[PDB]
Amino acid sequence: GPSPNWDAVAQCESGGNWAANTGNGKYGGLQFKPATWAAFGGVGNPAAASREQQIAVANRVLAEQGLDAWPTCGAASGLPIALWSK
């Protein structure tokens, strides 16, 4: 079973701050935009959601969009980009 390293992706995206909310239009450890978070079943502010809830919503984004949803940081997942970009 694959296990994307979302902690690694979060380090890339936010410096590992699962509660990131700096005013750049992105939220939480994985820097979700609100329209993507809502679209994949997230509610409220991603920065208020647990790491585990954030990861749950990322796993859904991955299945539908691939690691293209994190175009620079996706490689840090440890999944081969050539196979998981879509």
Residue numbers in the entry: 1 to 86
Per the authors:
Later, various experiments unambiguously demonstrated that the RPF domain is a peptidoglycan hydrolase. The mycobacterial RPF proteins share a common 70-amino-acid RPF domain and the presence of N-terminal signal sequences suggesting that the proteins are translocated to an extracellular location.
The asymmetric unit consists of eight copies of the RpfC chain. Chains A, E and S have the most residues modelled into electron density (Gly1–Lys86) with an extra helix beyond the end of the conserved domain (Gly78). The final refined twinning fraction in REFMAC5 for the deposited structure was 0.463 for . Despite soaking and co-crystallizing with a range of substrates and substrate fragments, for example N-acetyl­glucosamine (NAG), polymers of up to five repeats of N-acetylglucosamine and NAG-N-acetylmuramic acid, and peptido­glycan fragments that are generated by a number of enzymes, we never obtained clear density for substrates in the active site. The structure displays a very high degree of structural conservation with the previously published structures of the catalytic domains of RpfB (Rv1009) and RpfE (Rv2450). In RpfC two residues display an elongated conformation (42GVGN45), very similar to RpfE (137GSGS140), to connect α-helices 2 and 3, while a 310-helix (321GLRYAPR327) is present in RpfB. Based on the structure that we have solved, we propose that the five RPFs from M. tuberculosis have similar substrates, although variation in charge around the active site may give rise to small variations in the specificity for different peptidoglycan modifications. The high degree of conservation of the RPF domain explains why the protein is functionally redundant, but most importantly shows that the auxiliary domain composition is mainly responsible for the functional variability.
